[PDB]
Design a binder for this molecule. Structure first.
Ligand SMILES: *[C@@H]1O[C@H](CO)[C@@H](O)[C@H](O)[C@H]1NC(C)=O
Ligand SMILES: *[C@@H]1O[C@H](CO)[C@@H](O)[C@H](O)[C@H]1NC(C)=O
Ligand SMILES: *[C@@H]1O[C@H](CO)[C@@H](O)[C@H](O)[C@H]1NC(C)=O
Ligand SMILES: *[C@@H]1O[C@H](CO)[C@@H](O)[C@H](O)[C@H]1NC(C)=O
Ligand SMILES: *[C@@H]1O[C@H](CO)[C@@H](O)[C@H](O)[C@H]1NC(C)=O
Lengths: 350, 350, 350, 350, 350
């Protein structure tokens, strides 16, 4: 038998196969299993509120027609150039921007057909998908990003979408993200869609992302701690009143302010207050306190600037110094560890 | 009856249905009801003067042809591949940039037809639409953005566009905007269009947006208040003449100026003066006053630098200090609350 | 009579209408009237040297064919789907980048035909057009932007382009630009094109744009004036030699320099010197003078630092102070008003 | 004779003209003359390493077929809608990115045919072309940008490309570039291409660009000179040891550093050292020297701070001052003029 | 024999050549040799994690059909307009974004056919390819970028891809990269692909890139060294306690911090610590030490500020100075050379 003759008999003019009619017309809904392979992941930006993903969609369904039973083999790998004639289920993504195809040299498509009629359709598509991330806790946070596959034009009575029991989602080996660590959980559940026009099927896939704090710690926490320690020692040995003494505080003020402004750049605008803002606010309070104590001791010195009074004022000023000395490391220590442990337990609960 | 035979009889060669002729030719204008569903909203930028929206257009009209009365069911869900043969009303948007279609796997289209001839056309389109926002009051403002649907090629005698009496505009559940809060009002009115060529139908939909001031307050108001308070206390204990005393003022000057420059970055250029500019101007006036009073007390000290004269100059200088002390918090307090209450009442009127 | 039968008789196979032949072949040139409507304007950027415009092109010409005289009405509104068969005049823009079409739901096109043969073609196109603006005077300037319509493929003997006597250019009501004010003058003149291949027709439309200086004044002139006044008073009460006195000058130097650098950011690079540069240069000269006078009085004090000599040096130093006092406001006043009046008269002449 | 009948006889089914066969098959190579007109030029960016150009390609060749000799006129201006049937020579650009066509209203194309068979093909194309500029001397430099036209698919035995003897390259009148001045030289030479597959024809066009230094001088040279002069005078009158004296140097240090960082922004990264870097380095050396001399005189003063020794130390310190005084202007003068004259002669040689 | 008649006999209707069937059907897999020519390279950005490349793909395979043996010559250069009829092997790239074709004037394609049936297919394509660079050592690093060619739709039994024994990869003469130096090694190995659907052939090409450190050294190392030396000398002659002395340290602090922030701008965010960070950290430690020693000597002076005690405190303070003097150059010298030699040996091993 020649291949061409059979090939036109299967889906051509002698065949009564109209490509505008669903298989099993006036019958039970056509069940469709969907298997997705993630070729690549990444390019997630906080401002844009979306990520980039390259998938290999694969969907299988059954047809009562296109059952040959004439060649001795089980399956046939057909050309992807008559895919227009074969009926194709509609499938679009709800949180989707763009989503072009790939056409390098030839269109990237795959067609297979078995003896019973089970087909295999494979399409490569790069999707920009919108993820509504919540930045309540900026340095440490778990982000859930949603992929939705749903039927635009058919009701419940047709095109029921089902997941695959085994190996529903696969990932490429040695695939890494610079910023996040992917979690191998990938919980799958499906939520149907209700509209005034009708009720439409949908299936959902969920991915969990964990950020890496190493960059954040080196970029912000480590310099800020250095500034705090520097300020502490600078006043600790500072003596009486000198214009030079003021310089140590002045440098810290400006540098801390610039760092604070710099940190709130990449992130988009949100009403709620992030954790990094809290850390910046407390460090600003500490540096603001530094000036305060100086003003205080200067006021005591001003009152001092008779012999009977001098001893008490000089003593009171020194008392202010030693009390500042013991107080400043202690309250920062009891606060930062409290901050870290409370964030440590919230991530553990999440 | 086979589905294919009926399907070609309805809109094919045996049918006298020419797709270039409007239904009810030489007759009353074809009425069209339009229902819009907002799939997603967002990506509004002040500079660009436009926003991004993903809608689900739905338009219904009646045809005297395409009335089958042969299958026992009421409606038929047809394929979206013969939509070219069906006559389609022209519809374009006036404040429109771009507005591509979506073609993921298959074109996103929907076709339905009832027994009487009422059709249902559904198209997914992402529109970039221009909104002429007025920034007279920057931190608090209500913005109205306009969507216009109008007929490019037909006159009044044809293609009259009407709204839908019930559920004209729907919104997706759990849809949020990072910057703005959408108001559930959505007032609908229609304005016809007049041209030299003729008079063309149009319908309009209006959306109200309310900005969230939480980001603005934390970003700008809170640091500026801190700078003002710091400056106040800094001079409050400042004593006589020392080069060190000057430092407190110097830091504030530069930091305030940098913040003022930084704030006017995101916004585009406009002739009128924004509220934030007013707040920045008054704070700059306060810090400018700080230097002034110093210069004054230094001039009194310069005159002082004989015994009879010294008491009066020293007293006058101290008088200047205490008067500065009582005056500075009081006038800022009576001004900021006045500013807030006047803006509070203008938003209430708006 | 059926509409379809007439519709194919007019421009089909029974008709000898070849769409590759110009009307009035071997005859006088085909005159074409062009009417343009500006749907929207804006998005002008100085660096890119171009603007964005959305027009409604409309062109009318006569054909000896397509004269029906069979239906009792005067005109017919045809579908825009047989516009390919109708002969269309070539028309392109010389200072053009891009210029895509609009295809939302359906192509935006319009076809009309009268009894005599006068047709009406309407096309919506968004054009990015290059405007060679001259920035000799930056804050105040009038910019002329050119739109050119010309025939790519035909000579003088064919396709003569003429303007419309009445209402050649219309503008949408309530159309505004954030930066510029449009002038309702719109002078129209036409310049033919000469090439080695031949002579080609062209028509030109000119628009005048006037910038709004309110943003510029608030952004730059008002802070710079404040810095100048501050500097003036700061030295005015400055006494003898103190390291603190220097601070007043130091702050001004840096802030003025940063503002000067900031101002020359948006503008692209040009050889000639802008007006804003002149204003920045004079203010820099004033602040530079401030340091000078200080150095001078310090040199007199250094010579002073015997009793007979002290009186003359102290007097000379005070003389320098009072002379500085009277001189500094006077020369700035006689210069700034001179600057403003000369620019006021140049705009009036322009 | 009707135009349509002749028009289909020339390139249709009765004609044996196959559009897949080169003219003069099994014969001498088809010679092609190429004339280029530069409609616009500009948009050159140093980082991207490419420029934007809008050309009017024009190529002429001879065909033995398509020789009519039946109409009494010499040439015919055909429609650009049967250009697909006419055989067209392949032509692509080697240093090419993008290069789309223009389709405003109608495709921009031109067809002409003479009695002998000489055709004229005109195509409008905007090309982004890569120019490998060498930035050895940044402020003054001559840049050569290359345009290459070559045959992708044919060997030497076919499609020989020749230039045009007269008026090979034309430029539009009144065409200017904001940054560069075009030179009216435009030397043309051709270099053939060798590959493993075969030898392919190519022709090359060269353009020379001269930068304008006016922006660079005002932006960088003039402020830097002002800073140098200021520093010079500031120390020149500086007296003994005062903390205030230090301020004059401190301001210069920071401002010079910021300017130095600012200048190296637009330019991309290169291994070799630019001229502007040299100028920045020498000015940094001068300001660095300023601090040095201060440290020296302070060390002499420190040793001074017995009567016999005081006279010699005070004298030595004053000697250091006067020597600094004479030395500093002289060495800057003998260096800057040397720098300018050596660059003046290198541009003259180039 | 006419060329047209043979041309349609080879791949037309009289020929039984179906373009949907692979050559050697039901036979051994079709071997394909692939030769790639790199027309241009460059535009590599660290953030995007990808590079731009313009290649000339060339693939050869054998067909049992299309064996003419009728013209006396060996090969024929066909038109690229019947390339659709010829069967073409599928080929796509795995680490691929975009990859459009080039269509300037005509499509860039090449067709050749020999007497035996060996064909030659040439396609020009610009590919954006993702390179997973590792920035463990930023200033000096070798980067490997991967190109993968693989068969989308066929299994092992068909379309085996083989490399070319001689001249597999060629590069254009005089091709340079501004940032990197290409290594003439280009090791080629192939790795097959395993999927649930089946096993698919692939081949890989590897390129090695070496960065040039000249820009980095001038941009960062040279200024930082200057700051370190300046700081060293500044304290080296600094005397006792003066507010002026503090200035030398203050300037360094701010400038070093700004440089440190500036350096970490171009690079994207990564968890691990780069070499440049280490160098910045050590320089920050040195400048931080500068303040420390000052505080120490000031504390000794404070204790000093009775005659018996004064000699020991003054001596101890001077001892601190001389010890600082000998210590500071020595430890920087023993550290920087150690840093350079360890990086020198790691690059040599790599
Ligand atoms: C799809 O599956 C459901 C439940 O398993 C079944 O009731 C229905 O008949 C199936 N439809 C088919 C096989 O077309
Ligand atoms: C549309 O509605 C108007 C007013 O209800 C009516 O006069 C007109 O006949 C309608 N046109 C139709 C039904 O085609
Ligand atoms: C166009 O107008 C000119 C001048 O009015 C006239 O000479 C010419 O015949 C006209 N061409 C037509 C009507 O085709
Ligand atoms: C092209 O020119 C060359 C040299 O002038 C000549 O030998 C060749 O025959 C020409 N080819 C033609 C006219 O086809
Ligand atoms: C391809 O090469 C392999 C090994 O050289 C060989 O076994 C196979 O038959 C070849 N396939 C062909 C020539 O189609």
């Amino acid at each position: 038998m020649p291949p061409s003759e059979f090939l036109d008999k299967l889906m051509g003019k002698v065949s009564g196969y109209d490509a505008r009619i669903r298989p099993n017309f006036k019958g039970p809904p056509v069940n469709v299993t969907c298997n997705i392979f993630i070729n690549s992941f990444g390019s997630i930006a906080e401002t844009t509120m979306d990520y980039r993903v390259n998938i290999f969609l694969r969907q299988q369904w059954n047809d009562p027609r296109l059952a040959y039973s004439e060649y001795p083999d089980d399956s046939l790998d057909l050309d992807p150039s008559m895919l227009d004639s074969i009926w194709k289920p509609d499938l679009f993504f709800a949180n989707e921007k763009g989503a072009n195809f790939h056409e390098v040299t030839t269109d990237n498509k795959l067609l297979r057909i078995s003896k019973n009629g089970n087909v295999l359709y494979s399409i490569r598509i790069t999707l920009v998908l919108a993820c509504p991330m919540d930045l309540k806790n900026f340095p440490m946070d778990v982000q859930t990003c949603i992929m939705q596959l749903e039927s635009f034009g058919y009701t419940m009575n047709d095109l029921i979408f089902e997941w695959d029991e085994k190996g529903a989602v696969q990932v490429a080996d040695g695939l890494t993200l610079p910023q996040f660590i992917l979690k191998e959980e990938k919980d799958l559940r499906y939520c149907t869609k209700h509209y005034n026009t009708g009720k439409f099927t949908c299936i959902e896939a969920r991915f969990h992302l964990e950020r890496q704090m190493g960059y954040y710690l080196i970029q912000m926490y480590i310099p800020s701690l250095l500034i705090v320690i520097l300020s502490w020692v600078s006043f600790w040995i500072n003596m009486d009143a000198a214009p030079a003494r003021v310089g140590l505080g002045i440098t810290t003020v400006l540098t801390m302010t610039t760092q604070s402004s710099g940190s709130r750049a990449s992130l988009p605008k949100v009403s709620y207050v992030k954790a990094i803002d809290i850390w910046m606010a407390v460090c600003l309070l500490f540096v603001f306190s530094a000036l305060l104590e100086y003003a205080a001791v200067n006021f005591i010195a001003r009152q001092h600037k008779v012999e009977e009074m001098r001893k008490l004022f000089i003593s009171r000023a020194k008392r202010i110094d030693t009390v500042s000395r013991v107080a400043f490391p202690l309250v920062f220590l009891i606060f930062n560890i409290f901050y870290w442990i409370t964030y440590k337990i919230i991530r553990s609960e999440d």
